[PDB]
Ligand binder design. Structure first.
Ligand SMILES: Cc1cn([C@H]2C[C@H](O)[C@@H](COP(=O)(O)OP(=O)(O)O[C@H]3O[C@H](C)[C@@H](O)[C@H](N(C)C)[C@H]3O)O2)c(=O)[nH]c1=O
Ligand SMILES: Cc1cn([C@H]2C[C@H](O)[C@@H](COP(=O)(O)OP(=O)(O)O[C@H]3O[C@H](C)[C@@H](O)[C@H](N(C)C)[C@H]3O)O2)c(=O)[nH]c1=O
Ligand SMILES: Nc1ncnc2c1ncn2[C@@H]1O[C@H](CSCC[C@H](N)C(=O)O)[C@@H](O)[C@H]1O
Ligand SMILES: Nc1ncnc2c1ncn2[C@@H]1O[C@H](CSCC[C@H](N)C(=O)O)[C@@H](O)[C@H]1O
Lengths: 240, 239
């Protein structure tokens, strides 16, 4: 049971989230508009935990420079193939140092939840502040806050494309300060038969004030906007 | 063991999810029986499984009994049909010491036999348990000409807090279908569990079924369509 977005799990990622109705084109359009509201001259964007680089692909149409940081080599390989021109980095949002600063540092789809507690979140936000330009914005899509988390939640969905049928079932429970989300897959095709895969993640249920404390310790002013890309809302931060 | 444990426990929910209507099939079956035997009063369901047909057939026939090889399936059937006599046994060699107006074998259970000889044997046993005015009914598996290798079935159903996803894959293995079936079973407390079964279901030709019926002294007819699109064979003694 893996926790590192690798192997076959990485290969299924885009198909499954497409099946669940995720619309990266609309999300990118909205994000780019939000960046330009806070920074009308923005010409550059770093997407941290870029995964398979789906947002970056669309954001390349709005900004002259897009870069990405991704911990998982297998996700990153997909991201690079999708963004063959972009400079994408293999590393860790807790401790990274790129060549430059950007008008927007973004961290989407609750990837920030993969951090383990307040020290790590603080560290990541300090790094984001370190890579943002003075008239820029830091954008973090949080995981659920403890008060909005729904333990016992089961998601199931099946999709097919290109001869491959993929079923994904998730189960979520409370494990201390985090969601434990277990995810099983059945992957079927006419000649390959059926294979079973599993993943299991601890995604931290930070409170709003814990997010805010992280932005604040980084020198960033912080604003929460409810709703956002997944019903989890959006944090925006501005330097100095 | 085939059809055992958690697989047996999931059987009814997954086939309900797939739209299988045992109430309508039982009514159609009862009508077919009574067309051939208007005073029909008894029925034996061979390979009765969880006893879903029998539950409904008991409202049409004064006596219903069943034969089932799997203990875990049989336990379910008994709980569903607590007034009925259900036997633990094998369609290839059983002997109940009585006869019935109908002997039925539904949902391609006959595919669990291998070879002409086992098929002949079963049909002889069915003839040995049918009344002389009655009828043997067997739902075949697919004929070779209609089998679709590489077939993938996937569906998800939820009942009572439990979400079950079933995915089957089918290929050719000699003169049979190899069907492998994976389940993901999920619930708020239970989490997710994975289960798997795998079966060989023999691709008997139409002529093979007819040979089995004729050797058991039954006059045979194939009725196309049937409960599953695979038709139904009927057989009447005294040929
Ligand atoms: C609607 C609603 C949902 N939830 C929770 C329950 C459950 O944990 C989740 C819905 O399950 P899903 O299987 O639909 O979760 P998902 O597609 O959002 O995947 C989640 O986990 C993946 C493993 C991660 O890769 C992913 N991010 C980090 C990329 C993460 O967002 O959202 C709540 O806690 N409160 C709610 O009001
Ligand atoms: C429509 C069509 C289907 N098929 C085949 C392909 C595949 O093997 C099957 C459809 O898949 P499914 O997973 O829908 O099969 P099913 O719910 O009917 O389960 C079958 O297998 C189960 C393991 C058995 O327990 C069961 N009987 C013996 C009780 C048997 O009927 O039917 C064909 O070969 N040709 C066809 O034209
Ligand atoms: N410490 C860390 N630094 C960088 N990336 C991380 C990380 N911990 C987890 N990740 C990455 O977080 C990503 C979560 S999946 C989200 C991917 C992408 N933002 C999207 O919207 O589709 C994964 O690719 C995972 O490898
Ligand atoms: N040799 C044999 N004798 C009796 N039952 C058998 C058999 N081989 C397989 N079976 C039974 O055949 C059944 C197939 S499942 C079909 C069950 C039922 N007739 C229904 O329509 O739902 C299983 O319960 C299996 O255990």
């Amino acid at each position: 049971p893996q926790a590192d977005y690798s192997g076959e799990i990485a290969e299924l990622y885009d198909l499954v989230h497409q099946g669940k109705g995720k619309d990266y084109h609309r999300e990118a359009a909205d994000l780019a508009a939000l960046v330009r509201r806070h920074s009308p001259k923005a010409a550059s964007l770093l997407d941290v935990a870029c995964g398979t680089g789906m947002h970056l692909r669309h954001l390349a149409d709005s900004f002259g420079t897009v870069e990405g940081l991704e911990l998982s080599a297998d996700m990153l390989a997909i991201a690079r193939r999708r963004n063959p021109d972009a400079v994408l980095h293999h590393g860790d949002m807790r401790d990274f140092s790129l060549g430059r600063r950007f008008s927007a540092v973004t961290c989407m789809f609750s990837s920030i939840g993969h951090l383990a507690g307040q020290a790590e979140l603080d560290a990541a936000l300090e790094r984001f502040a370190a890579h943002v330009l003075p008239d820029g914005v830091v954008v973090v899509e949080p995981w659920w806050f403890p008060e909005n988390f729904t333990p016992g939640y089961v998601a199931a969905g099946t999709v097919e494309a290109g001869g491959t049928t993929v079923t994904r079932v998730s189960h979520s429970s409370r494990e201390g300060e985090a969601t434990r989300i277990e995810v099983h897959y059945l992957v079927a095709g006419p000649d390959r038969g059926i294979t079973h895969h599993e993943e299991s993640h601890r995604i931290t249920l930070f409170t709003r004030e814990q997010y805010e404390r992280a932005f604040t310790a980084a020198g960033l002013s912080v604003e929460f906007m409810p709703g956002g890309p997944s019903g989890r809302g959006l944090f925006t931060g501005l330097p100095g």
